[PDB]
Ligand binder design. Structure first.
Ligand SMILES: *[C@@H]1O[C@H](CO)[C@@H](O[C@@H]2O[C@H](CO)[C@@H](O[C@@H]3O[C@H](CO[C@H]4O[C@H](CO[C@H]5O[C@H](CO)[C@@H](O)[C@H](O)[C@@H]5O)[C@@H](O)[C@H](O[C@H]5O[C@H](CO)[C@@H](O)[C@H](O)[C@@H]5O)[C@@H]4O)[C@@H](O)[C@H](O[C@H]4O[C@H](CO)[C@@H](O)[C@H](O)[C@@H]4O)[C@@H]3O)[C@H](O)[C@H]2NC(C)=O)[C@H](O)[C@H]1NC(C)=O
Ligand SMILES: *[C@@H]1O[C@H](CO)[C@@H](O[C@@H]2O[C@H](CO)[C@@H](O[C@@H]3O[C@H](CO[C@H]4O[C@H](CO)[C@@H](O)[C@H](O)[C@@H]4O)[C@@H](O)[C@H](O[C@H]4O[C@H](CO)[C@@H](O)[C@H](O)[C@@H]4O[C@H]4O[C@H](CO)[C@@H](O)[C@H](O)[C@@H]4O)[C@@H]3O)[C@H](O)[C@H]2NC(C)=O)[C@H](O)[C@H]1NC(C)=O
Ligand SMILES: *[C@@H]1O[C@H](CO)[C@@H](O[C@@H]2O[C@H](CO)[C@@H](O[C@@H]3O[C@H](CO[C@H]4O[C@H](CO)[C@@H](O)[C@H](O)[C@@H]4O)[C@@H](O)[C@H](O[C@H]4O[C@H](CO)[C@@H](O)[C@H](O)[C@@H]4O)[C@@H]3O)[C@H](O)[C@H]2NC(C)=O)[C@H](O)[C@H]1NC(C)=O
Ligand SMILES: *[C@@H]1O[C@H](CO)[C@@H](O[C@@H]2O[C@H](CO)[C@@H](O[C@@H]3O[C@H](CO[C@H]4O[C@H](CO)[C@@H](O)[C@H](O)[C@@H]4O)[C@@H](O)[C@H](O[C@H]4O[C@H](CO)[C@@H](O)[C@H](O)[C@@H]4O)[C@@H]3O)[C@H](O)[C@H]2NC(C)=O)[C@H](O)[C@H]1NC(C)=O
Ligand SMILES: *[C@@H]1O[C@H](CO)[C@@H](O[C@@H]2O[C@H](CO)[C@@H](O[C@@H]3O[C@H](CO[C@H]4O[C@H](CO)[C@@H](O)[C@H](O)[C@@H]4O)[C@@H](O)[C@H](O)[C@@H]3O)[C@H](O)[C@H]2NC(C)=O)[C@H](O)[C@H]1NC(C)=O
Ligand SMILES: *[C@@H]1O[C@H](CO)[C@@H](O[C@@H]2O[C@H](CO)[C@@H](O[C@@H]3O[C@H](CO)[C@@H](O)[C@H](O)[C@@H]3O)[C@H](O)[C@H]2NC(C)=O)[C@H](O)[C@H]1NC(C)=O
Ligand SMILES: *[C@@H]1O[C@H](CO)[C@@H](O[C@@H]2O[C@H](CO)[C@@H](O)[C@H](O)[C@H]2NC(C)=O)[C@H](O)[C@H]1NC(C)=O
Ligand code: NAG
Ligand code: NAG
Ligand code: NAG
Ligand code: NAG
Ligand code: NAG
Ligand code: NAG
Ligand code: NAG
Ligand code: NAG
Ligand code: NAG
Ligand code: NAG
Ligand code: NAG
Ligand code: NAG
Ligand code: NAG
Lengths: 449, 222, 126, 53, 41
C-alpha cells in the first residue's frame, strides 16, 4: 500500500531552453559549387527522408516574439557576411578625387544624371607610375566636395569589393538541433503566432528557409493557410511592427534595362578592381512590375482581416513611408548581385471604406551598401553583365500604424522595416527549441527485499 | 542614458521650427525616440516616433504634412522640423526614450528618459481628480479610467523639471522608486497611491497608455 | 502503437511509461561554423554521461526502470497511486516535484548503494 | 635597363622566415580508435587488387 | 611663461598627415610628452 520511488529514463519531458543550432541544406545545393556560394561549404547534408512526429493530445505554447532562433539566425548571417568578405579585395586606395561628368545621353533637365562618368588616378602593379582610368558610378555612390566628387563612404568606414566568385543567392537552409534537443512545430491552419497550439509536432530539422534579406515587401516566403495572417506583439501598440503573411503570392517582376560592361582595371600586384564600362544600348532605369488585379485582390483580402482587430466599420488608409534612410523608405533587395531600392508609393496609396496592366515602380541601384546598420565594413557590389531579370513572390508585408489617433475611426498604415530580425520572424513563428529531460521519478508498489 | 536637447525659442506665426536631441549612453539603433509636446493646462500630445535603424518614422495624424523627423546616426542626434506654426503650437517639446531597450526587443511607451525640454512660443483616458491639496504624511490616491487596456504608466513632473517615469505596467515600480509608491487596478480603473507624502513628491502626475496621456493631477502641499 | 519521440507527453504517466525506450533511443543519436556542431555534440555526450552517472551511482545501473528502498514522503505532493499514473502528465508532475528532486537524488546516491553495497560486502564474505 | 619582380601582377609575396626549415622529416600517419591501417606485405604488390599477406 | 627649469616636458609638434584621399596631405599639430618624442639631426 505504501508507494516506492522508481526512476524512469526516457520520459517525454521537455522544457523551453536555448541551444546551439547547426545547419542543413540538402545535397543538390552543394553541387552548385562555384567556389562556395553563400554559406554551404561544410554544412551537413539534409536527411533525405525527414521525420515529423505529430504529438497527439499535446498543446504547446509558442512565442514568435520571444524566440531565440531569430537572434541566432541573425547573428549567423552577420558572421556569414563577415567571413564572406574577409578574403576579398579591399578597396582602400579607391577614395581618390573623382573628376566626374554626365553620362553620354541627350537631355532633358529632369533626368538628373543619376549615372556619373568619373575619371581618376589609380595605383598600378608597380609602385611608381599611376593610372588615369575612368568608371561609371551611381549618384547614391558618390558625393561632390568643394566638378570633383568622391565615394560617399569616405569618412565612414573602409570598403572591400565583393569577390565575383561567390554569390548572394538565398539558398534553403535547414536549422537542426543537436542530440537531447528538439524543435516543436505548430501545424494548425490558423496559428496567428503566440500562445497554446492544439496540434503540435516534433522535428529534428525545419523546412528550407531561404535567407532573403528585404524590407517592406517579404519576398520568397511561406504562404499562409486559408485566410491571410496578421501578426503583432501588441496590436494596440503602434510602435511594434505588424507582420502580414499572404495566402496567394503576388507576382513581381524586376528588371535592370542596363546590360553593363565589367572593366577589369588592375590595382596590382594581385588585386583587381571591377569598374563599370560603357552601357550598350539605351539609358534606361531599373523598374518593378506588380499585377494590378493581383494587388487589388490581395489588398482587399488583407483589409478584411484588418477590420477584425480595429473595428468592423472603420476606414483603412494606406500611405507610403514617412521618411528616413533609403533602406526603409524604399523596397531594398538584392537581384542578380545588384542592390535595388524601389519606389513603393504606387502600392500603398489607397483608402478602403467599410464596404488590366502592371504597376511599374521606379527602382534605384546602389553598389556601396552598409546593410544591417553596420559601420566599419562597406561592400562594393561588382557590376553584373547582361540585362538582369528576376521574377519573385510577394508573400508578406511589414506594416506600421500611425499613432496619437484618439479622434477618428480611420487607421493609416505605412511600410516599415529596418530590423532584419522581423524578416526571420516571418518563418520561425511555427518553431521553438526544447531540451529533453528523460529522468523522471514516480511512485509504485515496487522494491526489493 | 542622457538626452541633450537644444534650448527653447520664440517663433512667429507661419514660420518653421527645428529641434535637436542628442542621445548618449546606449546604442542609438536599439529603440525609437519619441517627440511629445506639453502645453500648460492641456493634454500632452504625442507627435511621433523614429527608429534610428534606417530612420523609420511615424507621425501623429494632427501633424502629418507639417512635421519631418530625421536623425544623424554618426552623431546620434535626432532632428525634428515643424512647419506652418500657429499659436496652438506654443508648448514645451520633449524627446523621450522608453525604459525597456535591449538588442532583442524594446517597449517604446514607458518613457523613462526625457530631455530637458524646449519651450517654444509662437505669437480615452479620464484622470481624476484635477487637483489635490494634501499635507505631508497623508496618502494621495490618483485615478485613471481607460477604455482600451494595455501597459499603463504613471509619471511625475516637478515644478520646472522634466517628467520622470514613476510606474509602468500599472503595478511595477521603476528604478529609484520607493515602496511608498504603489499601483493597483480594477477593471478599467487604475489607482496610483503615494503614502507618506514629502516635499519631493509634490508636482503634477500623469497617467499614460501608449501615446495617450491623462489630463494630469496637480498634487500641492497644504 | 508507436507514437514516436516525445509521443506520450500529454498522456498519463502510466501510459507514458510504455514509451520509455523511444525517448532513450534518440537521446544520443549515434575553419569556424564547423565547431558550432562540435561543441554541441560534446555537450550532448556530457549530458548523456551525466545522466548515466546518476543512473549508475543509484540502485539501478540497469536503465529504463529500477526500484529503490526509499519510502515515499507524503510532503512530496501527497497523491495516490491512481491519481498519479492515471491523472497527471510527466511535465505536470515534474512541475510539482521540482523542489524535491535534489533531495531525493541525495537520498538515492548516498543512503542506498553506499550502505547497501557495504552491507553486501559484509554478507558476501561468509 | 629597368627590371621588376616576376610576380608583380600575379599575387602577393611573403619572405620565408630564416628560423624554420624545409627539411623533410619522417611523419607517421595514425588512425584514431575504432579504425586501423591495412598494410600489404607481399614482395610483388604492383599496387591494386587482392593482397595475399 | 618660463622659467628655464620647467624643461618644457610638453612639445607642440606640427606635421604632415595622410587624409582620407591618397592625394593632398594634412598639416595638423598635436601635443606630445617629452618621453614620447626624440629629436633627430
Ligand atoms: C491570436 O489569436 C488568439 C485567438 O485564438 C488570441 O487569443 C485571444 O486574444 C484575444 C484578443 O484579441 C483575447 O480577448 C481579450 O483578452 C484580454 C485578456 O484577458 C485576460 O485578462 C483579463 C484582465 O485581467 C486582469 O484584471 C483582472 C480583474 O481586475 C485581474 O484580476 C487579473 O489579476 C488581471 O490582472 C482577465 O480577466 C481575463 O480573464 C477572463 O477571460 C479568460 C478568457 O479570455 C477567461 O477564461 C477567464 O475565466 C476570465 O473570465 C484574461 O485572463 C481581455 O482583457 C479582453 O477583454 C476582456 O476584458 C475587458 C476587461 O474589462 C472586458 O471589458 C472585455 O469586454 C473583454 O471581456 C479580451 O477578452 C483573449 O484573451 C485571447 N485568448 C487567450 C486564450 O489568451 C490572440 O490575442 C491572437 N494574437 C494576435 C497577435 O493576434
Ligand atoms: C525567389 O525564388 C525564385 C525561384 O527560383 C528565384 O528565381 C531565380 O532567380 C535567379 C536569378 O536571381 C535564377 O538563377 C539564374 O537564372 C539565369 C537564367 O536562367 C536560364 O538558364 C537556364 C540554363 O539551363 C535555363 O534552364 C533557365 O530556364 C533560364 O533559361 C541563369 O542564367 C543564371 O545562371 C548563372 O548564375 C548563377 C548565379 O549567378 C551561377 O551560379 C550559374 O552558374 C550561372 O553562372 C554562369 O552562367 C552565366 C550566364 O551568363 C555566366 O555569365 C556566369 O559568368 C557563369 O559562368 C542563374 O542560374 C533562377 O533561374 C530563378 N529560378 C528559377 C526556378 O528560374 C528568385 O531569385 C528568388 N528570389 C530571391 C530574392 O532569392
Ligand atoms: C567617360 O568619360 C571618359 C573620359 O573621362 C571617356 O573615355 C574617353 O572617351 C573618348 C571618346 O569620346 C576617348 O577619345 C578617343 O580616344 C581615341 C584614342 O586614340 C588614341 O590613339 C590615337 C592614334 O591612333 C591618338 O591620336 C589619340 O590621341 C589617342 O591617343 C581616339 O582615337 C578617338 O578619336 C576618334 O574619335 C574622335 C571623336 O570625335 C574623332 O574625331 C577622331 O577622328 C577619331 O575617329 C577619341 O579621341 C578617350 O580616349 C577616352 N579616354 C579614356 C581614358 O578612356 C568615355 O568616352 C566617357 N563615357 C561616356 C559614356 O560618356
Ligand atoms: C549587352 O552588352 C554586351 C556588351 O559586352 C553585349 O555583348 C556583346 O554582344 C555583341 C553582339 O552580339 C557580340 O558581338 C558578337 O561577336 C561574335 C564573335 O565573337 C567571337 O569572336 C570574336 C573574334 O571575332 C572574339 O573576340 C569573341 O570573344 C568571340 O569569341 C559575332 O559572331 C557576332 O555576330 C553574330 O551575332 C550577331 C548577333 O549577336 C548577328 O547580328 C551577326 O549577324 C552574327 O550572326 C557578334 O558580332 C560580343 O561578342 C558581345 N561581347 C561579350 C563580351 O559578350 C551584348 O550583346 C548586349 N546584349 C544586349 C541584349 O544588348
Ligand atoms: C562624410 O560622409 C557623411 C555621410 O556619412 C556626411 O555626413 C552627412 O552629410 C550630409 C550632407 O552631405 C548632412 O546632411 C545635412 O545636414 C545639415 C545640418 O545642418 C545643421 O548642421 C550644420 C553643421 O553643424 C550647421 O552648419 C547648420 O546651420 C545646421 O545647424 C542640413 O541642414 C542639410 O539640409 C543636410 O540635411 C548630414 O547631417 C551629415 N551627417 C552627419 C552625421 O553629420 C558628410 O557630409 C561627409 N563629409 C565630407 C567632407 O564629405
Ligand atoms: C535631345 O535634346 C533636345 C533638346 O532639349 C530634346 O528636345 C526637347 O524635347 C522636349 C520634349 O518634347 C521639349 O520640351 C517641350 O517644351 C514645350 C514648352 O512649351 C512643351 O510645350 C512641349 O510639350 C515639350 O514638353 C523641348 O522643347 C525640346 N527642346 C528643343 C531644343 O527642341 C530632344 O527631345 C532630345 N532627344 C532627341 C532625340 O532629340
Ligand atoms: C512577369 O512576367 C511573366 C513572364 O512574362 C508574366 O507572365 C506572363 O503573363 C501573361 C499574361 O497573363 C501570359 O500571357 C504569359 O504566358 C505569362 N508568361 C509566363 C512565362 O508566365 C507575368 O504576368 C509578369 N507579372 C508582372 C507582375 O509583371
Ligand atoms: C549635366 O549637365 C548639366 C548642364 O551643364 C548640368 O547642369 C548638370 O549639373 C550635369 N549633371 C547632371 C547630373 O545633370
Ligand atoms: C591624376 O589626376 C591628376 C590631377 O591632379 C592629373 O594631373 C593626372 O594627369 C591624373 N593621371 C595620372 C596618371 O596621374
Ligand atoms: C479594387 O477592387 C475593389 C474591390 O473589388 C474595388 O471596389 C475597385 O473598383 C478595384 N480597383 C480597381 C482600380 O479596379
Ligand atoms: C512617398 O511618396 C512621396 C510623394 O508623395 C515621396 O516624396 C516620398 O519620398 C515617398 N516615400 C517613400 C518612402 O517611398
Ligand atoms: C516615388 O514616387 C512618387 C510618385 O511618382 C514620387 O512623388 C516620389 O517623389 C518618389 N520618391 C522618390 C524618393 O523618388
Ligand atoms: C494616389 O492615388 C490618388 C487616386 O488615384 C491620386 O490622385 C494620387 O495622385 C496618387 N498619389 C501618388 C503619389 O501618385
Ligand atoms: C511563386 O508563385 C508562383 C505563382 O504561382 C509559383 O509558380 C511559384 O511556385 C511560387 N514560388 C514558390 C512558392 O517558391
Ligand atoms: C501586449 O503583449 C504583452 C505580452 O504578451 C501582453 O502581456 C499585453 O497584455 C499585450 N497588450 C495588449 C493591450 O493586449
Ligand atoms: C517528510 O516531509 C515531512 C514534512 O516536510 C518531514 O517532517 C519529514 O522529516 C520528511 N521525511 C523525509 C524522509 O523526507
Ligand atoms: C491516498 O492518499 C492518502 C493521503 O496520503 C492515504 O491516506 C491513502 O492511503 C492513499 N491511498 C492510496 C490507495 O494510495
Ligand atoms: C516550492 O518550494 C517553495 C518554497 O518553500 C514553495 O513556495 C512552493 O509552494 C513549492 N512548490 C511546490 C510545487 O512544492
Ligand atoms: C624652449 O625655449 C627655450 C628658449 O629658446 C629653448 O632653449 C628650449 O630648448 C625650448 N624648449 C624647452 C623644452 O625648453
Ligand atoms: C609637410 O612638411 C613640409 C616640410 O617639407 C611642408 O613644406 C608642408 O607644408 C607640410 N604640410 C603639407 C600639408 O604638405
Amino acid at each position: 500500500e505504501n508507494l516506492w520511488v522508481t526512476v524512469y529514463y526516457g520520459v517525454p519531458v521537455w522544457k523551453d531552453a536555448e541551444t546551439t543550432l547547426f545547419c542543413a541544406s540538402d545535397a543538390k545545393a552543394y553541387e552548385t559549387e562555384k567556389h562556395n556560394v553563400w554559406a554551404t561549404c561544410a554544412c551537413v547534408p539534409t536527411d533525405p527522408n525527414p521525420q515529423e512526429i505529430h504529438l497527439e493530445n499535446v498543446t504547446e505554447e509558442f512565442n514568435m516574439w520571444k524566440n531565440n532562433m531569430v537572434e541566432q539566425m541573425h547573428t549567423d548571417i552577420i558572421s556569414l557576411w563577415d567571413q564572406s568578405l574577409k578574403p576579398c579585395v579591399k578597396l582602400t586606395p579607391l577614395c581618390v578625387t573623382l573628376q566626374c561628368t554626365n553620362v553620354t545621353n541627350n537631355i532633358t533637365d529632369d533626368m538628373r544624371g543619376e549615372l556619373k562618368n568619373c575619371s581618376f588616378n589609380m595605383t598600378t602593379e608597380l609602385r611608381d607610375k599611376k593610372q588615369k582610368v575612368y568608371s561609371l558610378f551611381y549618384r547614391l555612390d558618390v558625393v561632390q566636395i568643394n566638378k570633383e566628387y568622391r565615394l560617399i563612404n569616405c569618412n565612414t568606414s573602409a570598403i572591400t569589393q565583393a569577390c565575383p566568385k561567390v554569390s548572394f543567392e538565398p539558398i534553403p537552409i535547414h536549422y537542426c538541433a543537436p542530440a537531447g534537443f528538439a524543435i516543436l512545430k505548430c501545424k494548425d491552419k490558423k496559428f496567428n503566432g503566440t500562445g497554446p497550439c492544439p496540434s503540435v509536432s516534433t522535428v529534428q530539422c525545419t523546412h528550407g528557409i531561404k535567407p532573403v534579406v528585404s524590407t517592406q515587401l517579404l519576398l520568397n516566403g511561406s504562404l499562409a493557410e486559408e485566410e491571410v495572417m496578421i501578426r503583432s506583439e501588441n496590436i494596440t501598440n503602434n510602435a511594434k511592427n505588424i507582420l502580414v503573411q499572404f495566402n496567394t503570392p503576388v507576382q513581381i517582376n524586376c528588371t535592370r534595362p542596363n546590360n553593363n560592361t565589367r572593366k577589369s582595371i588592375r590595382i596590382g600586384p594581385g588585386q583587381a578592381f571591377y569598374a563599370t564600362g560603357d552601357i550598350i544600348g539605351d539609358i534606361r532605369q531599373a523598374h518593378c512590375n506588380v499585377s494590378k488585379a493581383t494587388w487589388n485582390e490581395t489588398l482587399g483580402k488583407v483589409v478584411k482581416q484588418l477590420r477584425k482587430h480595429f473595428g468592423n466599420n472603420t476606414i483603412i488608409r494606406f500611405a507610403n513611408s514617412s521618411g528616413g534612410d533609403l533602406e526603409v523608405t524604399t523596397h531594398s533587395f538584392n537581384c542578380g548581385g545588384e542592390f535595388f531600392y524601389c519606389n513603393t508609393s504606387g502600392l500603398f496609396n489607397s483608402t478602403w471604406i467599410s464596404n488590366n496592366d502592371s504597376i511599374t515602380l521606379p527602382c534605384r541601384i546602389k553598389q556601396i551598401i552598409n546593410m544591417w546598420q553596420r559601420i566599419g565594413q562597406a561592400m562594393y557590389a561588382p557590376p553584373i553583365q547582361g540585362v538582369i531579370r528576376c521574377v519573385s513572390n510577394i508573400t508578406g508585408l511589414i506594416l506600421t500604424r500611425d499613432g496619437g489617433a484618439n479622434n477618428t475611426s480611420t487607421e493609416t498604415f505605412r511600410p516599415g522595416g529596418g530590423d532584419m530580425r522581423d524578416n526571420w520572424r516571418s518563418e520561425l513563428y511555427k518553431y521553438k527549441v526544447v531540451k529533453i529531460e528523460p529522468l523522471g521519478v514516480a511512485p509504485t508498489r515496487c522494491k526489493r527485499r | 542614458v542622457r538626452l541633450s536637447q537644444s534650448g527653447g525659442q520664440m517663433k512667429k506665426p507661419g514660420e518653421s521650427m527645428r529641434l535637436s536631441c542628442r542621445a548618449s549612453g546606449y546604442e542609438f539603433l536599439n529603440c525609437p525616440i519619441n517627440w511629445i509636446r506639453l502645453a500648460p493646462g492641456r493634454r500632452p500630445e504625442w507627435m511621433g516616433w523614429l527608429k534610428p535603424r534606417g530612420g523609420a518614422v511615424n507621425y501623429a495624424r494632427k501633424f502629418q504634412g507639417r512635421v519631418t523627423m530625421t536623425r544623424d546616426v554618426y552623431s546620434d542626434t535626432a532632428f525634428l522640423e515643424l512647419r506652418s506654426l500657429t499659436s496652438d503650437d506654443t508648448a514645451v517639446y520633449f524627446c523621450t526614450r522608453g525604459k525597456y531597450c535591449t538588442a532583442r526587443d524594446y517597449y517604446n511607451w514607458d518613457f523613462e528618459h526625457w530631455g530637458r525640454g524646449a519651450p517654444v512660443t509662437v505669437s480615452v483616458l479620464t484622470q481624476s481628480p484635477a487637483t489635490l491639496s494634501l499635507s505631508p504624511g497623508e496618502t494621495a490616491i490618483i485615478s485613471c479610467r481607460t477604455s482600451q487596456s494595455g501597459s499603463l504608466a504613471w509619471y511625475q513632473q516637478r515644478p520646472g523639471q522634466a517628467p520622470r517615469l514613476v510606474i509602468y505596467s500599472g503595478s511595477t515600480r521603476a528604478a529609484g522608486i520607493p515602496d511608498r509608491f504603489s499601483g493597483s487596478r480594477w477593471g478599467a480603473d487604475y489607482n496610483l497611491s503615494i503614502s507618506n507624502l514629502e516635499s519631493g513628491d509634490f508636482g503634477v502626475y500623469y497617467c499614460q497608455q501608449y501615446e495617450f496621456f491623462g489630463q494630469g493631477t496637480k498634487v500641492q502641499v497644504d | 502503437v508507436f507514437l514516436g519521440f516525445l509521443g506520450a507527453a500529454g498522456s498519463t504517466m502510466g501510459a507514458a511509461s510504455m514509451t520509455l525506450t523511444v525517448q532513450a533511443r534518440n537521446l544520443l543519436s549515434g575553419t569556424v561554423w564547423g565547431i558550432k556542431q562540435l561543441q554541441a555534440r560534446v555537450l550532448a555526450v556530457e549530458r548523456y554521461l551525466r545522466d548515466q552517472q546518476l543512473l549508475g551511482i543509484w540502485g539501478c545501473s540497469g536503465k529504463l526502470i529500477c526500484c529503490t528502498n526509499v519510502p515515499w514522503n507524503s510532503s512530496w505532493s501527497n497523491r495516490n497511486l491512481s491519481e498519479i499514473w492515471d491523472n497527471m502528465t510527466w511535465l505536470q508532475w515534474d512541475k510539482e516535484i521540482s523542489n524535491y528532486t535534489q533531495i531525493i537524488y541525495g537520498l538515492l546516491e548516498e543512503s542506498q548503494n553506499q550502505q547497501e553495497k557495504n552491507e553486501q560486502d559484509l554478507l558476501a564474505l561468509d
